[PDB]
Amino acid sequence: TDLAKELVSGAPKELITERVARIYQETETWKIDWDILNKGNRWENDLMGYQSSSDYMQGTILKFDTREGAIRFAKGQGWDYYIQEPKV
Amino acid sequence: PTLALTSGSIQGTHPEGFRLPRPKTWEESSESALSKATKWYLLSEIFRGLYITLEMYFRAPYTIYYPFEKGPVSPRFRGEHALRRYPSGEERCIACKLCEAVCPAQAITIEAEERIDGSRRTYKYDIDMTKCIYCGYCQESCPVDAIVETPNVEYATETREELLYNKEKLLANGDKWEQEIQYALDADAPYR
Amino acid sequence: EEPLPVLRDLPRPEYGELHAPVYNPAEKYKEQIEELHKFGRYIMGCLPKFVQQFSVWKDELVIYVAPSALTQVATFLKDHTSAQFKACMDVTAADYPTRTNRFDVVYNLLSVRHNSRIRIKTYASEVSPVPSVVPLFQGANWFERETYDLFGIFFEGHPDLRRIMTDYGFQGHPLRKDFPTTGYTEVRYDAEKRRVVYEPLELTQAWRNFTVGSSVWEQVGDGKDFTPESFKL
Amino acid sequence: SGGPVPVFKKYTTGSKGIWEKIRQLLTLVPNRSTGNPLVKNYRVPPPGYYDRDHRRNYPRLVAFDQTKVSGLLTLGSAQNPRQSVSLSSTLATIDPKVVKSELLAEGGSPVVAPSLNKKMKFRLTEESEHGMYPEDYPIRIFAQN
Amino acid sequence: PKIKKAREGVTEMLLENHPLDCPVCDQGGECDLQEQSLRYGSDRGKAIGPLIKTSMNRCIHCTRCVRFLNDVAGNSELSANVIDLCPVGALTSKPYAFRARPWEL
Amino acid sequence: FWPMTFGLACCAVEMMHVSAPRYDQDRLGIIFRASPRQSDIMIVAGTVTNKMAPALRQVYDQMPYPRWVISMGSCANGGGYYHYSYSVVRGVDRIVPVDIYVPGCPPTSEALMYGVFQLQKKMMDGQTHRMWYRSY
Amino acid sequence: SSSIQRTLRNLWKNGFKKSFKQLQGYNDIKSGRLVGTDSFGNKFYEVDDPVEIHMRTRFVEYTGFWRQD
Amino acid sequence: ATQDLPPISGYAPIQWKRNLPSRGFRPVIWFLGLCTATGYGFYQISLA
Amino acid sequence: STKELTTARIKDISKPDENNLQQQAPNRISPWSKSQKPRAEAQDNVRFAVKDLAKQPRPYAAIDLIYKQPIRYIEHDNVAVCDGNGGAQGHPKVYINLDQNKAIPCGYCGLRFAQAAFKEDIES
Amino acid sequence: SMMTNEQVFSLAVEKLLNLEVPERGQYIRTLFGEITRVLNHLMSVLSHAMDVGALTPFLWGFEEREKLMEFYERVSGARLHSAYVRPGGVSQDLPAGLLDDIYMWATQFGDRLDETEELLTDSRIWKQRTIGIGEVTAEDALNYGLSGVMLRGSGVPFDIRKSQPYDAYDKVDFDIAVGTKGDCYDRYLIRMTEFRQSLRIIEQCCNQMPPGPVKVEDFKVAPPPRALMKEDMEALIHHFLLYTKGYAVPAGETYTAIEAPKGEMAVYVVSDGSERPYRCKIRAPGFAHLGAFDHIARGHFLPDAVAIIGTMDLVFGEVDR
Amino acid sequence: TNPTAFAQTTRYVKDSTEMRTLVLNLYRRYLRHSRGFVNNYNLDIPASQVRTKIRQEFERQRFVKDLPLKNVLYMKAQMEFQELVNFWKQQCHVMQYFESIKGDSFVQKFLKGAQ
Ligand SMILES: CCCCCCCCCCCC(=O)OC[C@H](COP(=O)(O)OCC[N+](C)(C)C)OC(=O)CCCCCCCCCCC
Ligand SMILES: CCCCCCCCCCCC(=O)OC[C@H](COP(=O)(O)OCC[N+](C)(C)C)OC(=O)CCCCCCCCCCC
Ligand code: SF4
Ligand code: SF4
Ligand code: SF4
Ligand code: SF4
Ligand code: SF4
Ligand SMILES: [K+]
Ligand SMILES: [Zn+2]
Questions:
Q1: Signal sequence: where (chain G) (predicted)?
Q2: Are I82 and E19 in contact (CB under 8 A)?
Q3: Which of H12, H18, H19 minimises the CB distance to D9?
Q4: Measured distance CA(D50)–CA(E40) in Å, rounded
Q5: Which residue among J16, J115, J163 sits closest to D117, beta carbon to beta carbon?
Q6: Is there a contact between B141 and F90 (Cβ–Cβ < 8 Å)?
């Protein structure tokens, strides 16, 4: 938790600061994904209508098992995050 | 009972006569010194090697003459993607997006809506032939045989832009190669 | 001086009704499961201190040890004549981010003598080192470098550990779960610089994610037990 | 048995006429074909629920740790009956006659590693059998016996 | 066991007159007929508005299109909830029809 | 027409089968030359990883003029199967100019010959020495 | 199959004009029964010689003289 | 009938064991020929 | 005429021409989908400057080749069976209830059907 | 070596799925297991012969590869990458008359090895280039984890087809080859023997071919026939569900190794109960062998580097998987 | 097997003081090869410039605290030394290594698109 592991993961500097990861629960396990970019997340390519993107974390989802396990991971990597409590 | 008493196995038992015999010495050679020297000095095996090569000089080469002749093809050949069409003229494709899901290389791009007549069709259908792997799941996934791979391979293009097939290009091939696709399907019907 | 036949014109059998047997494949492992359970118990007998647990799936035997106990067990599994696992075929890993020691370093061994394979599985964290198995097997000198390159796992005692599968100066270890499948940068040629230069990632078509329509229901249950009755309470 | 076979029993282009007898005089081995396939036969006509379920009954995943391991020597077995309960202490204080039947097999003899296939038994073969290289060549041929 | 035949019985009965409209179903990728005729079943064998694309050809009935109406909603400001209640593609949304597949959204 | 043996991946098997006795590229005057100096064509066959792309540019820049590049297969054209890989150049056209693209996975031995023929038909259309007289 | 006996027989049957067309693109003087032409104009021939190898029993003669596609 | 199945008798056996019969006269004869070729040749050179 | 070329319609007021390269298809002018981009707009791009429009792929529109086909009729029954009209290489078999009094198209082929009695009423 | 590569992933999934391929399915995988081995060894031996300098045997064998790749294209459709052996049997049944054409090639092919052995086996230049070049001890070969020809070249009589039988390999009979000196010439003799032994099985697979299905008759792990997909509501549902979501593999882990033409090729596959595998590590026989290059090539000359690489049968697509 | 030039065993150092001395020698090793890096890679920047950039590299991350993360940073920096000294990185990568690299007000980012 106190460890600055970001210097060994090799991730770019933007993940530590400018990105936000949501810890949600879709029905028995928790997931982590990054919120979309302000602009440049999806622009229509003017050639063939392809869904272009500059966000490299759009396709990434991590399947966890327990809530505290996910929170442990987010603190370990030095990730900004928030937790969405599912409705009962 | 096994050899577990001695911590051994029938597997660990090498076959009878596994160990090598004693190697020969110079006095235990069948061919005399002169016999070995003649083969050695006169190049007996090389000259035999030359003769066998000369045998092939008087045989018919396998070469065929492209493009005046082609090699064989099979009805299952996977080549140029093509969008088929009903005899009545209406498109076979009803826009499952089964196409976009199976495609291992994600080379299929489909967008669809209700047509004017209301029958479900698609207005966008693009294949990135530079991204496709000619896997064949196109043809297998169709519940109406709308997308099939023709036996064509000679469609190399100067500019890479020409390799992005939109719907009209796929429909043009579907008409242009229709009779050939009839050969392929009607010769592969029993095995599917 | 006789004419060759024509195989299409040969008489052929005619086959009608088919009775393809449908029985559980696990029956052919009935003895195999029994043999392996004793062997794992035997290793725990010979190594009470190191063998935390074990499990046998069909005809595969797994040994779980701590990083400290790795080289000790592998040395026993190499030299002890009851288990002569001389060749280390594979040194693999995988990432499970939930646990504190996310990684799971594997060791597949081959015994040409006794004709069996074993699987030493020792956990590892992003920082906890794992002793190198080079002093036992020199064949893991390249299997560990792949594991370090694709995971970042720190291998203690490697004679020379470095990048083996990624580009020179590559940043990040790809086979992790948090590493995006498309990477962070891609290269191109810049005429003004007159060299091939790295640049931030740009996709003309983004990797569409189709996992959203996955299964919401259960697919497989407990199954049918096949544990030999000699290894039950 | 793959002994020598004449040219006219191999589906290949042959020799018609006196050229056959010319070929049989010059060629070193007369029973080898040119390798060109028979145009008249080769590729002449072109190609133009529970009772049956096992995946749901897959073997389960059960792990045996030091706690459950100790229980087999003391209580016995579910066929032949006899928290953290450490094994090391149990091995320090338990009857060796339990060991020579449970923890070991055949009177304490170590269990040889279980063979992935028992019937892998080899025998050394000879030249007249397998038709391979003679003895001087530095290989030997094994069979399944 | 014996119980599994009940799933193999109800599944067989439902898929008796059912149309083979899975490719052309508006919500063919998420109907609880397919996903429940796979896990538990065997393997071998008018219009109401400009909002609900009715096709009773695909019904399995259960009158959930009926029971809800006389209970919750009761020219109905809530009649669109029938779309989300019918499991099979019997009553699918009209505006969304033939435009997307659940595995992509 | 002397290409360069730049086989990298599974596409390289087809480039060998053209030289095989069935097709015999040698009949058309095609003799692969290993060194870039002796080769006036460069058939980029197979995946061009990032770890290779700087090296590929060094090999291309050493070909004396005139020089042509043929992109065979999906990987060389636009990324192919590995288009979404962290260490795969998505199309070799980001590194070297290409004169003809052969589509396939792998393109059949005839498809490459067809791609060779089309490029030959372009070379026979060259008008350099008339360009000096009329366009220069 | 490659000797001058086959070439001379195929040279004499075809006449000079057709053969010289085969000596410009084909590089192999061949003869065969015409099996018809397509819409574009290519003439599709089949060979009845017992000497041709397996894959060379069907060929074409393109409309063009210098270039074939 | 409606499938691909080998014939009831099967096929005739194929040749797969090594078959490389030797050729030529014994090395002594080739050696004796070399001597005679030299023996006759130096008779012709000497006459010339 | 800059009005129907960029609008979706059921049919075309004008008679189409096969030789007009601004139409959506040779056999239809207006596009047959609200989201479909009109061909006249697309060809007004940078990459069509020197490329010849004559050789571009212009397949005939589907929404016409069906409506030329006469409507099939059923005699003394109210269930229409259609499975591609080609054998086992067609679309999955579907049954069409004929209770409604108009032409009901098939699910996949687009073929339309009727009954014996309503043959005069539907044709109106 | 295509159909051998996909066989090891098909076996891995089959092992986890707890479903067994029927008899005719496993015979097709045995027959095309041998044909693939012939295809691979022709690329391995002849290029090794070509890299030494013998250009002619390379071209004689490549015509046979063209002749063998015809069989791949007739059953699957693509010449090289035949996505044929899928988890749960094969893709499609054999086309009629394929056995006749496979067998006919078998008779002719028997001579092709003989001429290959004429210009290589007894030639003194071929022996000089390879004899005593790259000596690997059997004890030291185990240490580096070598498998395949560069483990029986050193004298160990181990073979995976025998240690773990699979896919109708137990039914057939064949003799494995074991060297005695552990050098390139020994591995050449073993590889040449692998030609005839593989051709021996091809005769047995053609003769012993059984009738029946070619893939498991479970619609959840195999597409239903198209005659039945459009007729049966149960068939269409599984066709729709197979290609959109895929089948789910029960949880577990596995390591299945097969005798690839290079050596022991194995995949480590972890199943997370999902329709997508979680971890897929591939053991490439060419990966481990290239590691032992330092141990083997030390003390030899630069021309011996080519001979050592050739006898390793390197395909860097497999090395860098 | 014979390990390559400039190789070190991967060891989990269990001392705070020893790691301090290992790093100090390492920093000198980079400076000793300052002339070589210019001549090997044909860099446009002179020898003093490389030392200036190397110093900017070593000054940058001297304040780390975790010993378990000290060894990892020493291990990978050793690889960077080994890759560079053995002349393994291509010429382009070193040129771009030193060719990498003040913000703007909110109005400036609002107008063009920010991030
Ligand atoms: C009195 C008799 C006069 C004979 C005169 C001719 C002698 C020629 C040389 C004989 C010795 C020899 O070729 O030797 C072979 C040498 C050295 O072999 P080594 O190191 O001893 O290894 C062998 C060890 N043994 C003794 C255990 C077997 O290497 C070679 O393979 C050379 C290959 C040369 C190939 C040339 C091809 C040219 C073809 C020309 C026609 C097309
Ligand atoms: C006018 C001659 C010109 C060439 C002179 C040199 C020829 C080589 C023979 C000398 C060495 C020797 O003694 O070779 C002896 C060897 C080995 O015989 P073996 O193993 O004991 O036979 C085994 C037992 N038998 C005798 C019952 C069979 O025979 C050969 O394999 C001869 C090679 C055959 C073809 C040779 C000519 C091909 C080139 C084309 C020219 C027509
Ligand atoms: S053939 Fe396969 S890879 Fe290619 S577009 Fe079709 S589904 Fe995708
Ligand atoms: S499977 Fe057939 S009908 Fe469905 S989207 Fe693909 S081409 Fe269209
Ligand atoms: S409701 Fe489900 S089972 Fe019925 S047709 Fe639609 S997709 Fe198929
Ligand atoms: S809610 Fe759906 S399944 Fe139930 S009765 Fe109505 S249409 Fe049928
Ligand atoms: S395009 Fe296909 S065959 Fe060619 S290198 Fe890529 S994956 Fe291999
Ligand atoms: K619904
Ligand atoms: Zn219909």
A1: none
A2: no
A3: H12
A4: 10
A5: J163
A6: no
How close B81 gets to chain F, by Cα (Å)?
11
Query: For residues E22 and J244, what is the distance between their CA atoms, to the nearest angstrom?
Result: 12
Supply the residue whose CA is at minimum distance from atom 2 of ligand 3: B135
Cβ–ligand 1 distance for B40 under 6 Å, the answer yes
What technique determined this structure?
Answer: cryo-EM
What letter does residue J223 receive in the DSSP assignment?
P
Contact residues on chain I for B111, CB-CB shorter than 8 A:
35
CA nearest to A14 within chain K: K115
Task: Please name the residues in contact with C184: beta carbons below 8 A apart, sequence gap of 6 or more.
Answer: A11, A12, A56, C171, C172, C200, C201, F86
Residue nearest to atom 2 of ligand 4 (CA): B142
User: Does residue E91's CB lie within 6 angstroms of at least one atom of ligand 6?
Assistant: yes
CB atoms within 10 A of CB K15: 10
Among candidate residues J166, I61, J291, J67, the one with its CA nearest the CA of residue C140: J291
Of the candidates E12, E24, E97, the one whose C-alpha atom is nearest the C-alpha of residue E60 is E12
Phi, psi for residue B82 in degrees, rounded to 5: -155, 145
F61 touches chain K (CB under 8 A): no
- DSSP secondary structure of chain G: --SHHHHHHHHHHHHHHHHHHIIIIISS----EEEEE-SS-PEEEE---TTS-GGGSEEEE-S-SS---
Distance from CA of D24 to the nearest CA of H (A): 13
A62-63 sheet: strands from edge to edge: A62-63, A31-34, A21-24, A81-83
C217 touches chain F (CB under 8 A): no
Token pair, residue F18, equals 């053209």
Burial J276-291 (b: 16+ CB within 10 A, else e): ebbbebbbbbbbbbbb
Question: Cα separations (Å) of A46 from A43, B40, I24, I42, I45?
Answer: 9, 75, 20, 11, 11
Q: Separation of I110 CA from ligand 9 center, angstroms? A: 6
CB B93 within 8 A of CB B136: no
Burial class (CB in 10 A: 0-12, 13-18, 19+), A20: exposed
Tally of CA atoms within 13 A in the half-sphere of J11 that contains its CB: 23
- Contact present, B139 and B148 (Cβ < 8 Å): yes
- Shortest Cα distance, chain E CAs vs residue D61, angstroms: 21
Name the β-bridge partners of J256: J267
Type of residue found at C175: L
Residue J104 and residue D42: Cα distance in Å, rounded?
8
B2-24 burial string, b = 16+ CB within 10 Å, else e? Answer: eebeebbbebbeeeeeeeeeeee
Distance J119 CA to ligand 1 centre (A): 16
* Rounded Cα distance, C127 and K19, in Å: 16
Q: Which residues of K touch J295 (CB under 8 A)?
A: 1
Query: C173, C54, C57, C46: which is closest to C122 by C-alpha?
Result: C54
Distance, in Å, from the CA atom of A8 to the CA atom of K98, rounded to the nearest integer, reads 21
